Design an enzyme around this catalytic site. Structure first.
Site, mmCIF file in Angstrom:
data_model
loop_
_atom_site.group_PDB
_atom_site.id
_atom_site.type_symbol
_atom_site.label_atom_id
_atom_site.label_comp_id
_atom_site.label_asym_id
_atom_site.label_seq_id
_atom_site.Cartn_x
_atom_site.Cartn_y
_atom_site.Cartn_z
ATOM 1 N N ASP A 123 -22.024 17.940 -15.872
ATOM 2 C CA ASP A 123 -22.596 16.641 -16.242
ATOM 3 C C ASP A 123 -24.026 16.881 -16.751
ATOM 4 O O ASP A 123 -24.738 17.731 -16.191
ATOM 5 C CB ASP A 123 -22.571 15.643 -15.053
ATOM 6 C CG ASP A 123 -23.126 14.264 -15.375
ATOM 7 O OD1 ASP A 123 -22.506 13.547 -16.205
ATOM 8 O OD2 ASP A 123 -24.160 13.884 -14.776
ATOM 9 N N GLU A 127 -21.885 18.467 -21.188
ATOM 10 C CA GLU A 127 -22.533 17.550 -22.122
ATOM 11 C C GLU A 127 -23.859 18.193 -22.469
ATOM 12 O O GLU A 127 -24.806 18.150 -21.675
ATOM 13 C CB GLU A 127 -22.766 16.184 -21.481
ATOM 14 C CG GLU A 127 -21.527 15.497 -20.934
ATOM 15 C CD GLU A 127 -21.859 14.215 -20.192
ATOM 16 O OE1 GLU A 127 -22.762 14.239 -19.323
ATOM 17 O OE2 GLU A 127 -21.241 13.175 -20.507
#
Ligand code: CA
Ligand code: CA
Ligand code: CA
Ligand code: CA
Lengths: 1051, 341
Positions: free
Chosen positions: A646, A675
């Site tokens: 994340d 990400e």
């Protein structure tokens, strides 16, 4: 030796009160008040200016060189400016200066709705605004903020102490550094001497390289100094205090202890010969292991042994402790509270916990008792050895409640549990079973580590499945709300919710109002709120008290890999902790080593919240160690095949690569992706971003194809959600009433899509929207290079994910009134084909195959079972089930109403049609090694596109993949080449490009027939292809007992 | 013995040439050229604006909060901005920033009648404008400010040289201490060794007592060193230059000459036996008395006698000189101009 003392000056009282249509800013002159001499405030001036944000000023000087805006008066305390206003509402832009030089670092914005009186005060280099001269003066002559940085054993960085005659490091073991009844700083100190920032330091902390460096004395006892408080003090030649600030010590902690500390093992290490308890706490004054019974009664309290080299504390006990509960009783100074805190904390290295993670448990993950039968001989069903192996990766991003919360064929007691995956005879399990058989290779699990945001105590929770009475018992708020009347009814929360639908409208959003309250006491959260990184979540277990969760989780892994035959990806959240500070229940790391594990603001020492929540510091050695050690456990003890980080951009690229090399020694075929968006941490370190990771092997999600196919971008709100159509919403080809997208604007989305389909490579050459030959990196994406990757295995393409609107919801917002339910179903499939048939790694949200809807919910994290519903009994896609959350989607209600009723809600027939299409696309992806080349060089030597240039037909995406002699080796023994044709247009199209080429439609598509996405595709003997509207065709070039020339690339 | 040299990076060559009705400003990124990884120049922006003085700009952003004026491109050496112009004559107002914070202390004013090419280069906190990226790079990896203090015959105070492996006192009698075509510091030097501030020094200069002390070699010829330029140099174990700064020598001048110099009389001392001309100039390479007529025509030029103990220069002439005009013709290194004036 000079004593540091306070200035003998009374506290100021404004001197000037701000009147109507005029504001007053006071400069609290520190240098002015420390001086018994008068000051010349001529040099002082405010650069005042009107902008789109703060426009309340009346006649602001344009000229930056204009020093004419001198003080409107002065006194002992400093000058003041009586600023004329246009309006008593809004705000003003003030830049406080001494000549053409900023006195306050940040551009001030004085909000008159924050300071009612309009009489405000500021101090030089303070950035803060005070309501009074008093509040400012107190702040000025106090220990305030955390400006100083102890970066290594010898070095203290502080801009506030720059050029000052007296620079000292005051300290107190058991008390706060302060001024006595005489206003003197009597506490012990060390004399600091000006030095220069070390080469080693500048590397470590580039964001502080400009800061003033100070050398500590050689007699300094670093270790005992870190036992308590330290304060950096700057004073006059006479000893009058200029500044007193708190010290940020993470730098020195890494420099003094990390080398030794890194070489140790942490947690309650139960091995042969007993159990070693080890906690790193280099500042703690005392640490004890407190051992608890099952009833949570103290069974033993053992003071730990401190290793001076490491600052680690340890304690060895018998193997009898297997299963005992424990916490570490800390005695530690916390800089947030400025006190020596005493509390019992759970282990950050805990591997098992009690209910609601209140106590850590001593465990042995290697115990047969914690293993499902034949766990030891469980293997990865899909290979991950080569780039070509990796490229085959087809991800289905699922959530534990989202999977089984609504499935009736799943035994009640297993709904919303890890064990739900064992319900072999369920609609959900059997659905995944068929998806796996058609080509879905990997299952991504949304937070399954220990989340903080769900009460693990059954009786402090109520779900929609249960009576409304239960909701009121647990939720105090519901008893005092517009729904209080239902506490008396013998109906469930599910029941009441369906009742509210009947009168739900944009003007009466009753469905979401009750849901908001439900959501506080539900079992539903995504879980991006880490409590403990290396323990499974207990609420997804049948019994959260003890080890039960470990066997259950493993049981789910075995079911996924053996019974469903898919690999496992765990979603990881190392970017933040759920909380920090010495009081929060969920603060674990910040209670043990305060100010270390969290990323703090350079001035204030406040834990940054860029990620949301409490920003962690993967740049610090021990937290980087924590991350690696955590991933080791999920790797070997949990048998996880891949990890999705994340907000990976918040991590240093060096850390991700380090962890990766480390994990590879336990599983050489492990995949890392995340990400990699800009995090804005480049001032601090080289971030793990899409750009920075080119050729590293670490994959990143690609937003390029995502935004081109979906339409618009995230942050779109209001009519923009309809106006910004995509290739798949009919941007250009079939515009909606609100659309204004140009032909070049539409052609540019085709350019981005194509690049994406070819694995978003930085070096891939193609023909742009204007007919120019351009490298992938040369194609723009909102100012950024479109293409960025070295190999397609470094790119993850997607058109739906848990965050943001579902693909269906986006089409509902973007499709023309003309697009009937049937074309919108194909629009979903067409959108998905760009991902499924492209060289990059295919990722998709669970439910896209069932036209999943969230009834326009954008951030469904705490929108419960209601909005995040996936009907595995296929009756509906959960569309139009209420107005979404007001807080985050209220701004889109008018757009929702405009589009909501435009077309019918899908039924059993439509969902079955979409599943058939989805299975088709995945089957195709696994039908040839040509679809998943893996190597960037292979892509460039074999992949090319047609219907390119200035003259291109909109919505037609034509990709050619060579297996011919000019490419190299024959990869597919059956084929010579491949053609992917996507007609994302309402008009049927023609393909004369393959003039006289002997092509045939895929056997996969031919078997499908009327239910094929290619249904109606014509292939004339003369090599001409007729493509129906909203269709996808895989045209294959059959090989003839020898590799011929296929579809060679050109330039 | 290690040679002090510049970082192993070739000298830059502009990369972008300024064309008609548009100027180009290069930021020479020192942190960026000291390498390792690629740099993010997004945060970098120019606050450009038109005023009564410098109005040649074409469409300058009004908003100070507007960080939108990001670099028009970049490379190893740093970013650059291609600024559009109204007129090829006059000047422009540039404020080089990293967010809403000034990188160069002073407000730059680029006079196109001073830089014909319109291709200009600047370094952070430098205030100076260079015609080339090369001229800037050389300046970046060279002698800057006057951080060092020669306070007594044996002591040099410099915080910049604190804890550094190589600390030296480079000197040049007739030239500036610089780097050659190979980027090496070939000029003569002396090795400095870490020491502690003397009791005598702490008294004299309390404002420098905290500064890092360095002992000069015993072979050091203090007198000839003060004849020209001296530069304090700090380098890596390998000899890569960290810092090069000018030296403030008033302390040593008092320590070496003031005792003797204090016991002499100054001016054009006309007494019995003639006129003694005496000027204290302990650093001057040469001093001559130039004697003028009433018409201010040179009547005599007499080189003076230097007293080594005092650094005072003298010349004795007849009592006939009563009423003659004069000036001292100096030959002296001025640290402000870095030249032998
Ligand atoms: Ca939990
Ligand atoms: Ca919840
Ligand atoms: Ca920051
Ligand atoms: Ca072949």
């Amino acid at each position: 030796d000079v004593v540091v003392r306070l200035p003998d000056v009374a506290v100021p009282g404004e001197a000037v009160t701000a009147v109507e249509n005029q504001a007053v800013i006071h400069l609290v002159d520190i240098a002015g008040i420390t001086s018994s001499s008068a000051a010349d405030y001529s040099s002082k001036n405010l650069y005042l200016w009107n902008n789109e944000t703060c426009d309340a000023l009346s006649a602001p000087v344009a000229d930056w060189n204009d020093v004419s805006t001198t003080p409107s008066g002065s006194d002992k305390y400093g000058p003041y400016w009586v600023i004329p206003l246009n309006k008593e509402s809004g705000c003003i832009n003030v830049i406080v200066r001494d000549g053409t030089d900023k006195l306050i670092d940040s551009d001030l914005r004085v909000a008159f709705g924050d300071f009612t009186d309009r009489t405000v005060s500021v101090i030089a280099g303070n950035s803060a605004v005070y309501d009074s001269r008093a509040d400012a003066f107190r702040a000025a002559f106090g220990v305030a903020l955390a400006e100083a940085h102890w970066v290594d054993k010898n070095t203290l960085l502080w801009p506030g102490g720059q050029d000052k005659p007296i620079v000292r490091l005051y300290y107190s073991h058991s008390s706060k550094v302060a001024a006595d009844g005489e206003g003197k700083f009597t506490d012990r100190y060390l004399k600091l001497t000006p030095t220069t920032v070390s080469q080693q330091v500048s590397m470590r902390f580039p964001h502080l390289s400009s800061y003033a460096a100070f050398k500590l004395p050689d007699n300094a006892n670093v270790d005992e100094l870190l036992q308590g408080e330290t304060v950096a003090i700057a004073a006059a030649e006479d000893g009058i205090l200029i500044s007193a600030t708190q010290v940020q010590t993470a730098g020195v902690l890494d420099d003094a202890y990390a080398e030794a500390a890194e070489a140790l093992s942490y947690g309650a290490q139960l091995a042969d010969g007993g159990v070693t308890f080890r906690v790193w706490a280099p500042t703690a004054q005392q640490v004890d292991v407190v051992v608890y019974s099952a009833d949570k009664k103290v069974i033993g309290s053992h003071p730990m042994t401190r290793d001076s080299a490491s600052g680690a504390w340890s304690w060895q006990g018998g193997s009898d402790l297997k299963g005992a509960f424990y916490r570490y009783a800390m005695t530690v100074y916390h800089p947030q509270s400025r006190k020596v805190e005493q509390y019992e904390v759970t282990d950050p290295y805990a591997h098992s916990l009690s209910t609601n993670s209140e106590y850590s448990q001593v465990v042995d993950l290697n115990d047969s008792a914690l293993k499902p039968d034949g766990w030891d001989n469980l293997t990865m069903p899909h290979a991950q050895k080569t780039k070509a192996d990796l490229a085959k990766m087809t991800i289905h991003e699922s959530h534990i409640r989202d999977l089984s919360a609504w499935d009736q064929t799943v035994p009640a007691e297993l709904r919303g549990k890890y064990l739900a995956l064992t319900a072999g005879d369920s609609n959900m399990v059997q659905h995944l079973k068929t998806l796996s058989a058609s080509g879905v290779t990997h299952v991504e699990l949304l937070p399954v580590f220990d989340l903080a945001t769900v009460n693990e105590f059954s009786d402090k929770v109520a779900d929609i499945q249960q009576p409304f009475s239960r909701l009121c018992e647990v939720n105090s708020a519901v008893k005092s709300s517009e729904f209080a009347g239902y506490c008396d009814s013998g109906s469930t929360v599910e029941e009441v919710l369906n009742q509210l639908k009947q009168s739900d409208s944009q003007d009466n959003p009753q469905v979401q109002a009750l849901n908001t309250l439900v959501a506080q006491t539900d079992s539903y959260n995504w879980g991006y709120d880490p409590f403990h990184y290396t323990v499974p979540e207990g609420s997804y277990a049948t019994d959260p008290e003890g080890t039960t969760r470990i066997k259950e989780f493993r049981t789910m892994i075995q079911a996924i890999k053996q019974d469903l035959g898919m690999n496992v990806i765990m979603d990881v959240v190392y970017n933040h902790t759920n909380a920090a500070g010495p009081t929060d229940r969920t603060s674990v790391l910040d209670k043990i080593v305060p100010w270390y594990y969290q990323r703090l603001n350079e001035t204030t020492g406040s834990v940054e919240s860029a990620t949301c929540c409490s920003d962690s510091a993967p740049e610090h050695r021990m937290f980087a160690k924590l991350i690696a050690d955590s991933l080791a456990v999920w790797t070997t003890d949990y048998k996880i095949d891949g990890f999705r980080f994340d907000l990976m951009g918040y991590h240093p690229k060096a850390q991700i690569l380090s962890a990766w090399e480390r994990i590879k020694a336990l599983n050489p075929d492990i995949y890392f992706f995340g990400e990699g968006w800009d995090s804005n941490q480049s001032d601090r370190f080289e971030i793990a971003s899409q750009i920075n990771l080119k050729g590293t092997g670490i994959g990143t999600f690609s937003d390029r194809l995502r935004d081109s196919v979906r339409g618009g971008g995230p942050f779109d709100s209001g009519d923009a959600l309809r106006q910004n159509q995509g290739i798949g919403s009919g941007a250009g080809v079939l515009p909606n009433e609100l659309a204004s997208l140009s032909d070049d604007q539409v052609r540019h989305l085709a350019d981005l899509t194509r690049l994406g389909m070819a694995g978003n490579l930085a070096d891939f050459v193609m023909i742009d929207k204007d007919g120019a030959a351009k490298k992938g990196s040369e194609i723009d994406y909102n100012g950024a290079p479109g293409g960025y990757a070295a190999d397609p295995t470094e790119v993850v393409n997607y058109v739906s994910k848990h965050d943001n609107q579902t693909l269906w919801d986006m089409i509902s917002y973007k499709a023309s009134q003309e697009a009937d339910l049937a074309t919108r179903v194909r629009m979903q499939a067409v959108s998905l084909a760009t991902v499924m048939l492209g060289q990059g790694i295919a990722f998709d949200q669970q439910g896209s195959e069932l036209l999943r809807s969230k009834s326009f919910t954008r951030d469904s994290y705490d929108s419960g079972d209601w909005f995040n519903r996936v009907d595995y009994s296929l009756q509906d896609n959960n569309y139009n089930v209420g107005m979404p959350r007001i807080s985050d989607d209220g701004s889109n209600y008018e757009v929702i109403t405009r589009v909501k009723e435009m077309v019918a809600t899908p039924g059993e027939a439509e969902l079955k049609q979409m599943t058939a299409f989805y299975q088709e696309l995945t089957e195709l992806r696994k039908s040839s090694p040509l679809f998943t080349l893996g190597d960037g060089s292979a892509v460039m030597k074999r992949v090319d596109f047609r219907n390119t240039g200035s003259d291109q037909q909109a919505g037609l995406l034509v990709m050619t993949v060579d297996d011919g002699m000019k490419a190299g080796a024959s990869l597919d023994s059956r084929l010579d080449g491949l053609v992917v044709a996507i007609n994302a247009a309402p008009e049927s199209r023609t393909l004369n490009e393959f003039a006289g080429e002997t092509l045939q439609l895929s056997a996969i598509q031919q078997t499908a027939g009327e239910n094929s996405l290619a249904n109606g595709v014509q292939i004339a003997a003369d090599g001409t292809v007729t493509l129906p509207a909203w269709s996808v065709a895989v045209l294959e070039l059959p090989q003839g007992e020898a590799q011929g020339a296929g579809l060679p690339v050109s330039s």
